[PDB]
Amino acid sequence: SLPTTIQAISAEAINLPLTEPAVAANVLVKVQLADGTLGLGEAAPFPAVSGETQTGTSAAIERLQSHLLGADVRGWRKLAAMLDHAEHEAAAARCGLEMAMLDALTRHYHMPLHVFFGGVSKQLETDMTITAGDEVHAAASAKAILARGIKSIKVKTAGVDVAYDLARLRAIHQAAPTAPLIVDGNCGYDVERALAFCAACKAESIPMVLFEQPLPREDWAGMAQVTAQSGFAVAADESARSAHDVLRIAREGTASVINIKLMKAGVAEGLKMIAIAQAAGLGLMIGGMVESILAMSFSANLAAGNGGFDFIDLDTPLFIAEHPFIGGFAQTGGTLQLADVAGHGVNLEGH
Numbered sequence: 001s002l003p004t005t006i007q008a009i010s011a012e013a014i015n016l017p018l019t020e021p022a023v024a025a026n027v028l029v030k031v032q033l034a035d036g037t038l039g040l041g042e043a044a045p046f047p048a049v050s051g052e053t054q055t056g057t058s059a060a061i062e063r064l065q066s067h068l069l070g071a072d073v074r075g076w077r078k079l080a081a082m083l084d085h086a087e088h089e090a091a092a093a094r095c096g097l098e099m100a101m102l103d104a105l106t107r108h109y110h111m112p113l114h115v116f117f118g119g120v121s122k123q124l125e126t127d128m129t130i131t132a133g134d135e136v137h138a139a140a141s142a143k144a145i146l147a148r149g150i151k152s153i154k155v156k157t158a159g160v161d162v163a164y165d166l167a168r169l170r171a172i173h174q175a176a177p178t179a180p181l182i183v184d185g186n187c188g189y190d191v192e193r194a195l196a197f198c199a200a201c202k203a204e205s206i207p208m209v210l211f212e213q214p215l216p217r218e219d220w221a222g223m224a225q226v227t228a229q230s231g232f233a234v235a236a237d238e239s240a241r242s243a244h245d246v247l248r249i250a251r252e253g254t255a256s257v258i259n260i261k262l263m264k265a266g267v268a269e270g271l272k273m274i275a276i277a278q279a280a281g282l283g284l285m286i287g288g289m290v291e292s293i294l295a296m297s298f299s300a301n302l303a304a305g306n307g308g309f310d311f312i313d314l315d316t317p318l319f320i321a322e323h324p325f326i327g328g329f330a331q332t333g334g335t336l337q338l339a340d341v342a343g344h345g346v347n348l349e350g351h
């Protein structure tokens with residue numbers, strides 16, 4: 001039993017109410033070291049299609065408890081590997097556990113997580129996402145985002161109707177003129193619809209700076225074709241769930257940018273995807289699922305600490321109505337500001 005032994009692992013459901021979708025059914029992970037330093041991680045399972053649940057996630061963390069109790073948090077990378085070998089499919093569970101262990105490690109040695117990952121910056125500039133409505137409400141959202149002091153915006157499109165999608169973009173670009181536009185196609189386009197969408201954006205000089213996952217993951221060839229021909233930077237999200245995916249992307253030119261979501265791969269795997277990306281000269285985006293200031297501030301500590309991320313998409317704290325946390329990043333406008341604080345800097349409220 002030395003100061004960095006794990007004597008306590010606990011997981012509890014956290015249901016965080018949202019402003020406009022209803023609840024982020026997430027899990028708070030706590031690891032406690034023998035010296036009393038506490039590390040916090042968050043699991044955010046998103047059950048779309050073949051997904052994980054809050055209930056399945058908590059149960060996975062309870063199963064993984066016996067594998068970490070009594071172990072030295074100092075073997076963080078070894079422990080991350082054995083979690084992945086025992087419970088690969090519970091990505092959100094392993095992410096929260098990895099976040100917690102690293103938080104504990106760095107808080108123990110009094111080191112900021114952004115310094116542990118590289119120390120390049122203490123500041124990120126995030127976009128903000130437009131909800132839905134119609135063409136009228138999207139123009140109003142575009143104006144509302146830029147009035148908050150946020151430079152770039154993210155828009156979700158359905159991809160089934162090029163004409164409607166374009167009309168939404170026109171409005172948004174007209175309403176918010178100096179905003180770089182990141183467009184999340186959410187696997188909805190095919191090659192023809194993606195190319196025709198891009199061609200029109202170019203023709204109208206619509207400032208899309210990223211076309212995010214326009215096609216389904218399985219259309220590897222189509223993804224590559226859009227990447228090669230469209231004249232826009234393309235991001236891989238669903239196509240990028242592992243380091244193996246990222247090697248494939250680099251090889252086939254599947255996309256030109258990787259959206260890292262630590263919730264989907266875990267931390268150690270995400271670290272390898274970053275290094276593959278940077279060495280292939282792919283751009284890096286950092287995003288998340290429906291996550292509180294906890295998981296988001298961890299992701300922010302990595303993006304800022306590593307360096308080299310051109311796209312920051314860490315805006316879900318602005319959509320959470322309330323939560324039990326203090327600290328983390330400090331947002332002013334679209335600027336996320338990090339501090340001379342050990343770990344990720346997010347803590348639980350007192351009273």
Ligand SMILES: [K+]
Pocket residue numbers: 184237287
């Ligand atoms: K996304």
